[PDB]
Structures are given as C-alpha cells and as structure tokens.
Design a protein around this ligand. Structure first.
Ligand SMILES: [Mg+2]
Ligand SMILES: [Mg+2]
Ligand SMILES: [Mg+2]
Ligand SMILES: [Mg+2]
Lengths: 388, 386, 379, 387
C-alpha cells in the first residue's frame, strides 16, 4: 500500500461522501476567499464583515442547525471539518464562525421560543445578521450583569469582556442575573444592535487574533422586551451548552492551524540549505517533522472519534476536555517547533507561522484553560476536586 | 445523558466487533488467571515456565494471524493487537515470548518457507509443543558477520547471535546469515533444530528488565543445515524486516497495556496515600499527571486500532508502523516514569517492574531514534541515517 | 585557553588546594574500596559495616565537626566534594554517610550537652559507632511519645524507613513530650525496649541497609535528651544539612552516567561509524554537559554562602530540587542511549528513590513558590 | 540570621566588585529612566530613536572592553555582561543595537585594524557620534567581492538583516578579495560619502522591532586602501566578533527572562480565580520555581564565563554552552510566562509578548538548527556531525 505522509491513517477514507463534500467546499472557500485577505487583515487589525454573507451563502454557518431554520442540517463531524479548513487559514476567521454557530445560533435553537427561532436563526444562517455572545466579566475571577424587571420587559446593566464580533454584531446573546422570587437566576437575553442602552466598543492593539474584530458589550439600562428572554433555560446549563459546542470546533480548528505550520516547516527545510544540503538532511530536523506528523495524526483520530460519538449521543462532556486540551496544547507545541525551524524575521511567506503561533497562544489561553481542563479530567478520575 | 468512562473515554469497547471482544476477554482471562499469579516470583528469580507456551497454544494465542490450515487460530491484526495488550498488561516478558513465537518465527516460515517447512513447523509452533527463536542480532542486519557456506547437501553456518529471547528453551531456530552467491553477499534465513551439532544456546542471566523471559545466545560452530532448511522465497533485508514489522505492531499494542497498568496502579495509590492530611490525588500536580496518562493512552489506542483496521484492509504502508511503534513505546515509558515518580516507597511496585521492562523494550532494537528517521525520510525524500 | 570538556568552567581552579585534596582523597577511597564492592552489594543487598570505619579513618565522617570532637574540622564545600565522590560510585554509600554526618553528628553537635558531644561525637567520627535518625512515621504530626518518669523518660512509638537502623549503635529519635513539643533523644543499641528490624527486598539503594525503629516503653535517662532544641527546628536543621550533601551527591551520579554514555557511544558502531557521529546523540551529550556544569556552579556557590553564613534555608530547596531532578533526567537519557540489558541501571534506580525519598509531591517547588508569593499551596 | 532574596537567591550582588556594581547601577538607571519610557511605542510602531547611541556613549556604555586610550570606558567582560543584562531587561532590540556597536564594530577595528583606523573610528563609536553596523550575512560561500583598483578596492554585493544599517555612519563589511593568488575573506570599513553604498530599511519585522534593520547594497562601492583591515583574513575575522557578541547575548537573554518572570509573578498575585490569587495554585507555583531556578543557575554560568574571559582561561566552546543555555532557557521562560497570562496583548503585562517574539528572533539569529549542541558534541567526541 502507498504511504500518505500528509494523512498517514487516511482520514480521507474514514469520512462519508457528504462529509468529504463539506470539507472540500470549506477548503475551496477558505483558500479562495480568506487566504487572499489574511495577511493584510492581520497586519491592519481589521476584518471584512462581508465574510459572514459569503460563509452563509455556502452553508458554513450554524452547521448543526436544521434546514427548517435556514441551517444546512449537518452533523458534528461536518462542523469539525469546516472549523479545521477555516483555521488552516487563520484562527481569527474560525473564531468569528465559532461565535456565530456555537455561541449564538446554538442557544437560540436549544433554548429559544418558536418565535425567536423563526426570527433570528434564518438571518444568522445566511450571515445577513451577525451574532455575538456576552458571558464573561472582570469579576468572575457569580456575575455582576443584572436584568431588572420593568414594565414590558427587562432593563440590563453591566459589562462583558472582549467579545469577538461585538462591534459589527446585529444580534447579542447576553447572560445576566434576574431576581426570581427572591433568588438570582442566570438567564439569557437576546438584544439587537440599535438598543439604546447598548454599546459595543471595539478593542485594538491585540497580539493574536488580529484578523477578527473584537470588542466589549456595555449595558446601561438596556431595555429588552419580555419576548426576548430565552424561555427554556436557567442557570449555568445555558452558557455551558454553548461553550461545550464551541470547544469542540476549537479542537478541530487547532489541528488545521498545526497542519499549516507543519506543511510550511517541511517545505522550508526542503528549500533551504546549509553546508551544501537541504536542512531536511539533518537528523534533528527530521525528528521534529516526525513529532509534528505523529501528534497531528493522533489528534485527528481523537476529534473524529469524538464527533462520531457526539452524533450518536454517546459522548460525555469530559471527552471534550480531553480533546480541546490535547488539540490546543499540541498545536501550540507544533507552531513553536515550526517557528524555531525558521530563520529571517517576518517578511517571507513562511512567517505565516508567526501569525499561527500568536493566534494559538491566545486560543490556548482565551479562557485560561489548558490547566483547568486537566483538573476537570483529574476530578473525573479521582472524585476529588483540586480547583480550589 | 451520556456517562463518562474514565478508564475508556472513547469507548474502545464499542469500536470492537463481538468476536474481537471475545478474543480480548479470553486473553484477559488467561493473563490474569495464569500469568498474574506467576509474575512477581518469575521476575524476582528470573525463571520462565516453558509450560506457558503450551498453555497459550491451547487457547490459540500463538501465531494469531496464522491460518487454521497450519494450526493457527486464523485471527486478524486487531485480534493480535488485543491479545498483546492483555498479556503485556501483566508483563512485557510474557508478551516478548509470544511476540517471538508469532511474529519472529511463525511469520517468516509462513511467508517465506516451502510447503514442507510450513507443514512441519507451523502446527507444532501453533500448539507451543515446539518453542521458537529468532537469531538476527549479533554482538557489537547488513553489518552481520554470521555466515553460511554452501557444502554438498546443504550449508555450514558459523557465527554468534546475542540477546535471543527463548533461545535456551527453543526447539526451532530461525537464523539469518550471509551467503555469498555470485560474488554477492546476501542475507538468507535458515531453520535449525535443537540437537543440531555445532549449535548451542547458553542462557544470559542477570538481566535488568524482561526478567520473566529467558534469553540467551545462539553460537554456531560449523552447524550443518540440510538444503531443505533454507527459507527458499526470500533474500536480503526483506526477510528480517517483514518479521520485525509484524512484531513492532504487537509491541505497539502491548506497550499500551503496560502503560494502562501503570496508570491504574498510580491512580489507586494516590487515592490511598495521604500527605498533609489529604489524599495525594487532591494535589493539582498529581491530577495533571493523571490527565496526561489518560490522554496519551486514549489517543495511542485509537492509533493502533486504526492501524490494525488498515492492515486487515490492506491499506497500511509500513511507515505507519513506525508512527505507532515510536508513539506507543515512547509514551508508555513516559507514563511508567510519571507513575514511578508518583510512588514514594521502595519495592504498588509492580510499576517498577513495568518501568524496567519498558526501558528494555524501548531500547531492544536501537539506541537511536530510527523510527523518527524512517518518517523524516518518508516526508522529505532525504536519508539521514548515515 | 584549552577547553576541558569534562570540566568546562574549570571547577578544579575554583577550589582551594585543601579542597582539591579532600576531593582526591574521597575519590581514591571511593574508587579503590567502594567501586569493587558495589556490584555484588547491590545485587545481593548486603552491607559491610566496616565501610564506616574506613571512611572515619580517612576523616570523611562529620566533615564540618571540629577537631576537638574527632572531626576533620572542614567546611560545607568539603562536605559536598566528599558526597559527590562517594555517590559517583553509589547513592547507597552516600546515604550511609549522609545519615552519619548530617542526621546524627550535626544534631548532637548543635543541640547536645557537652557530655553528649564528648561521649558520642568522637566515636561517630571514627565510624566505630554507627548512627541513625528516627523521624519518619507511618502517620504522615508524629505519634512517637516520651513520658516523664523517675530519672528520665519512657519512649513509645515506631519509625519507618530508617537508613542504618539495623546496624546502628546510636539512635537520634524525635518524639513528642508533654510539658506538647517535639524533643530529641539519644538512645543506644542495648537499651531495653528498642528494636531495629531490617527492611529487605528494596528496589533502590540496595547497597545501604534500612529498617524500622520500634520503641516499647524504652527508658531514656535525663542526660540523654538533647537539651538545647525544641520543635521543628531540631529535625529541620538536620534535614537541611543532609539535603545539601544530596545536591552534590546527585551531581556525582549524573557525571558517572554522562561519562558512561559518552564512552559507550564512542565504542559502539552503527552503519560503519560510532553512534557518537549522530546529531541526536550529540544533542543529548550537550544537554548532559550543560546541566551538570551549571548544577555544580550552583552547589559550589551555595557551599561558599553556607561557609560565610549568608545562605538562607530556601536556597537549599533550589539546589536540592535542581540536582536531584536533573540527575534523574540525565540517568534516564543515559539509560535510553545504552544497548543491551546489564552501572547506569543501578544509578537510575537509586536516583528514582533519592528523588522520591522525602515525598511524592514537589515540596521544594512549593517552598520556593511560597517564598516568592507569600501564599501557601501545600494543602 | 541570613535573609532569603527571592529575586537574587545566590546574591550575585555580593559576587561583584564595587566598580562592577557601579557599572550595573549606571546601566540600570539609564535603561529604566530612558529606555523603559520609549519601548512600548518603539516596538508597536517599529521606530528607533538614534539619540539612544549618543545617550549610551556619554555615560560610557558603548564598547565596554575598549581601552581608555581609544575613548572606551576600559572595563572588563563581567561589566559588559552586566550592561547587556540591564539593557535587555527593557528590550532585546536595544541590547542588539549595543551588541552591534560594541562587539561587531568596535571589537574588529580594535583587534584587526591599523593604528590609524583605531584612532579615527573608535573614539567616535565610543561616544555614539558615529553609529556602526556589521555586514556578513547574505540573502543567499560568500558572494560579496572586493576588486583591486587604483587607490583601493571596488566592492559589489549585498548583505541582509543588518542591524543599524539605515542609520549607520561606519560599515564593517566582510568580502572576498582575490589578491596575490589567494581568494580570502577580508574586512573593509566603509563610510557615508560612498556613492555605491546604500542601506534601505526593512520594515514589517515580527521581533526586535525597537531596533532598525536594513540591507547593505554595494554597487562598485569604492573603499580606499587605508580602509581595509590589515591584520586578519579568513573566518577568524567575523568569528571573533560573533564570539564576543554571543557572550553579551548570553547575559542579555537572562535580563529578558528576569523581566518575564517578574511580570508573571506580579500577574499571578494580582489576578484571581475561584476567589483566590492565581499564585495560590500549585501548578502556578511550580512554574515560578522553575523560572527562578533556571535564571539563578544561568547567571552563575555567565558570571563564571566572564571571570574566565577576564583571566584568559576561557575557550570558545564555553561561549557555546552559555549562549545555548541562556537563549534556550530564556525562551522557555518567556513561553511559560506567556501561557500564564493568557488574554490578548492589551494589558501592560503583555510586555511578555514583546519579550517572547524578541527572544524567538534572538534564538533564530543563531540558525535553524542546534549548531551549538553540535559544537559541544564534537568537542566531547572528536567527531563532526554538521554534515
Ligand atoms: Mg491527500
Ligand atoms: Mg449603542
Ligand atoms: Mg467498564
Ligand atoms: Mg546619524
């Protein structure tokens, strides 16, 4: 049999025909439309908002959302393959899609009323409306953002920390405390961009994820009508369902960025010489290439198996911790190995590696989680918590 | 709704066919019931009970991939893997004995032997009535000095092989030697039988690891081999390499069994032992280590399962074995070291045995990361061995 | 301007002439008298008590103890050099000396009465009496207890994993005394109620004998309590001294592993050239050389600071953690470079114990973390 | 009675002479007073204030080892090291500017120059009145070539990634010269009046953004006879300069590592998780212990090497040990620190991200490959593994 160095376990042959078609559609879009934009977008710290309508047209937004609500009605393995192809170009583009799909469409679909689903989901699916998600606050290190009941609805006050998409978003899913019969309960609210008490100031000066627009959400007596509270969830289950979905996409995405770094490093050491032979002739270099290949190959079997289990309903949430932690950690290690194999300083095409690297350094710590995921798995094995 | 299985997070159990589960359970029953009670004393005093071969043969654990026509159980590669894992879960020495019988003796006779050789040797090897060994390694493949000379009616062999598992109890010896034919010096395989004049197999005592398996030399001083005992259908490196590729697949599964044992022992130990009035398991540094053990085993097992499936389908290139052997052996040794460093006594210390075993397994073939270089050459087209 | 691969920073030039001779004396002894013993001693788990008298006659026991009490009146740098030369042969032998010098002679010298010092120290210094240190118990605050009786104290309890105990003549035992504080007691073998059964079948440190101390109403006369210490300061002073010797010793074992690996890869061939021609092997050799070289600068400096009185106890945590950790890493790298199944294996199993001897948790990391942050993370 | 100094456990301070402590304090006062306020903007916008050379020169930080006879401060290798560490504590870009001036320009003119050249160039380089650069590396043996002409030499070729070149007054360029039957590497001093010399800046760097870098393009650049270095030929010339520079980088990288450690430590004391400081976590304390350990041991290594260089007992291989160790451990520390901060570039603590990309370049300036490991391997085994 013939060896495929770039796909040793023939992942391509473990996919169904429809899945290969989705992967190929996502690849064609990412390489055709995102790859040409990324170098300038990252340099200037901007993003073309047109990307949402482009992705929506191809059916890449809300991959698991049924066709009834304008989604493409795909499964978790297809979601993963899409994330991998987008992040192969840039993690910032993957982040924008993660927010739209897992953090906005998912909670409206899972927890919203029929009216909310019919209004918001078709617009989010086409990318006509851009979404963002407001959860984390400075004091979380539970939450300060508060919905006060007023005639006709709720009045929200508080602020959420750097939210991807917020300065260009049309739709905001915000989690806030609501007094219910004397007790505070976490509830989700849908806000629209024109809300008087809502501001979404942009944040610039980022080191990583510069191709994605990021901002805050600031609420000062932001009125939300009664019909825009998510009726079918309360407590942490709401935001946690979203985060779980998003972390699955990140686990696949990180492997795409790792693959890009590996391919760049391999091509570089083939092209560059030292002492009259390619750098690839050195055992030390070959050892690094072997490690990159091994970890990506194993990582991919992991996320594929997880996707298959999620589609069957046999996947417990702890497995997401295994795979998110493994993909993000090993991807960062690979980007570092690749970076250390390059000479020069940022002018050449190979220094797309430096971009992947700073992106992965943010992604790995965007919640601050390689260590937290370890402790989730520790507790699951031992029945003893070591968080605090 | 879904339950988490900490000991099998990706539900490997559910990825197996019913008949594969049955093979695994039979191997587990045998290893736990018959090898586990022996291992502690066998390792301590460096004794091997040759009866083990007959026990394994009776239940069809020797030469798992060898067809029923020749006395084998006619299983596939995934089954071979599952068996190796269950045996090595007890001890790598026992797995090594099996590996040698199956991949280093039965495989080359099956692949490269004449009809007569297959009919004679394989059924007795399959039952364990005859015990086999594999003579490639010499004291300090292409570098070998063991030599065959053509004589009337056969060959005369002279030379020495070192660190040969099973040799002091072997009935059948597969020996690789150089034969100069047409001025061209090439490797050929020869089948020798115990009692051959000029063949001796003195034992090596005082091993650090793999003490549950008996190992020795093969010393050949003008050992006569009749013409009908040369393997007719192979010349050169393909011969020994085919055997080693088969054995490496089993070791990739086996090492993960030893790793699982170390993980499970470490986990139980840190639940039981206390420091500062809390179980050791309450320490973040300990939980991080347990997370890493779980992760590497879980992913390693997906790798070897997929490789086994590809081998059974005929879609696996030889380079894939390098990925998995390198990963399984390296990660297993890392896990055994992490487990060892979590223990605080001085001889639970099943871990110490697994650790010294894995140190030998990782070093058995080479001192140099040769699998990395196989993979680097496969990616770049450039050779970095010499 | 010549490079010395085996001593790149010329440690030999940073030592004074007396320190160089202490080192050379310990080396001559270790290589002449311990090296021929070690292979069989480790394999069969036998101890020869005469080793203590050999060491004592040379002046290697209690290096920091003054001449007035039988010591050679040396300093911490000298102690370190000795430990390093002994452990270059075997950690088990170093462990025997660590106990004698730091765990037995030190507390009697620092905390004992004049009578205790005059009686015990000269005999410990010559190795004619063998000491052991009873701190560790099965209960991970201690339960060994002294009760005041007419004429002295009655001691009851149990200590575990005590190096030298089955062959010891002198026992420094720490126990709680109700006034409730930890006190130190000197007992002798032959004291009614004291036993010291051996522990057999060890994985590492097999060249050293280890056991328990069992006390069942053992009478200790008033003149055998250490009068000048109470509380944790007693045992902690001893442990701090021992940890310094171990930091040096571990570097000796590491050096042996490095030198064995280097010679091996020069001797063995692959594809018609030494294994040493491979880049992967050279990187490993470079890493071994680097870590040992920097490790030795660290312990040397700490030794000079201890001798000047400028070293805080936390510095010992840095060096102990570093030396033991890096030594084990080097032993493992060296082990993985060898081919066969036969001294690196011994050093490796020894260093695995030495690393875990105090505990499984990275207590020294936590000591340093607390010292940087002001926040406790032990429990 | 001994107190523990967590930030200096082995009391490096007490291992220095009084004059060495004064040099260190002077460098620290300058770097903290004049470089720290510039660095954030300088790195963000990729700008370099050339006034820095004059500031450093007037307090005597340029060419530390150069004798007083030639305008240098007449200090020793330990002092050079201490200065580098104080500058790089602020930024590697600033240390790189100084490394070039001191080790790559003043050192070759001092070691290999005529008395006329030493008298002309060194006093001006020492004050920062003239800024130097060093042209060895080519865009890719050496292709830049000098041809004998009446009155001197005509140089053609190109050098790439040359720190200081777009602001330089003095250019030390290594070129092949075919002369009297042998083709040899020679060193040439070029200046601003040279019509065939240009030095366009390179912008868009990932790391070392606070230091200006350019090319040296030579198109029949005339260099008079009096401007060739007379007392060196072959690789000895540039290698002497690099060996000197590497010593300063070994000290410098420890300064950058110290900054990353101090930032991380302060962050984990200030930031909370589950109601307690991040510093309360065992996982975090382990990382802090590792940072402290490697910096402490690293500093003992570079101090000893400095003492040996000053005594004349240091072989060049020792520089490989320390360069490799300082750069490698510093980069590991910056990555540990980065991974502890998380977030994205906005806060003052993301000075760590700046040190990190700087150290990634400093390690890459060495090569694609662990060449210092192979220098050390050959020195232990007598076997070459470079080819
Ligand atoms: Mg393909
Ligand atoms: Mg507004
Ligand atoms: Mg089960
Ligand atoms: Mg100017």
């Amino acid at each position: 049999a013939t060896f495929h160095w770039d796909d040793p376990l023939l992942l391509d042959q473990q996919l169904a025909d429809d899945e290969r078609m989705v992967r190929d559609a996502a690849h064609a879009y990412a390489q055709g439309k995102l790859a040409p934009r990324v170098t300038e977008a990252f340099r200037h710290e901007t993003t073309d908002a047109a990307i949402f309508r482009e992705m929506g047209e191809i059916g890449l937004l809300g991959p698991t959302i049924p066709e009834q609500y304008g989604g493409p009605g795909l499964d978790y393995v297809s979601y993963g393959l899409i994330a991998r192809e987008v992040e192969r170009v840039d993690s910032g583009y993957r982040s924008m899609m993660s927010v739209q799909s897992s953090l906005v469409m998912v909670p409206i679909f899972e927890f919203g009323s029929d009216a909310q689903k019919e209004k918001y989901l078709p617009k989010l699916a086409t990318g006509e409306w851009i979404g963002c998600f407001g959860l984390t606050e400075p004091n979380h290190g539970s939450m300060v953002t508060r919905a006060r009941k007023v005639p006709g609805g709720y009045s929200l006050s508080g602020s959420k920390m750097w939210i991807t998409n917020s300065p260009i978003a049309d739709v905001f899913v915000v989690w806030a405390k609501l007094d219910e019969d004397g007790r505070d309960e976490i509830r989700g609210f849908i806000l629209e961009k024109g809300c008087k008490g809502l501001s979404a100031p942009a944040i610039h000066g980022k080191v990583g994820l510069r191709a994605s627009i990021t901002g805050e959400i600031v609420l000062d007596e932001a009125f939300v009508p009664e019909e825009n509270i998510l009726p079918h969830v309360k407590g942490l289950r709401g935001p946690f369902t979203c985060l779980n979905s998003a972390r699955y996409g990140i686990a696949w995405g990180a492997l795409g960025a790792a693959e890009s770094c590996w391919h760049i490093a391999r091509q570089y050491v083939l092209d560059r010489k030292q002492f009259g032979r390619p750098l690839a002739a050195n055992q030390l270099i070959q050892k690094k290439l072997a490690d990159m290949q091994t970890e990506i190959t194993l990582g991919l079997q992991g996320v594929l198996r997880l996707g298959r289990m999620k589609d069957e309903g046999t996947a417990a949430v702890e497995i997401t911790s295994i795979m998110k932690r493994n993909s993000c950690g090993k991807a960062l290690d690979i980007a570092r190995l690749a970076r250390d194999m390059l000479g020069g300083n940022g002018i050449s095409d190979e220094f797309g590696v430096a971009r992947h690297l700073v992106n992965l350094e943010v992604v790995n710590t965007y919640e601050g989680t390689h260590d937290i995921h370890a402790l989730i798995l520790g507790r699951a094995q031992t029945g003893i918590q070591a968080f605090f």
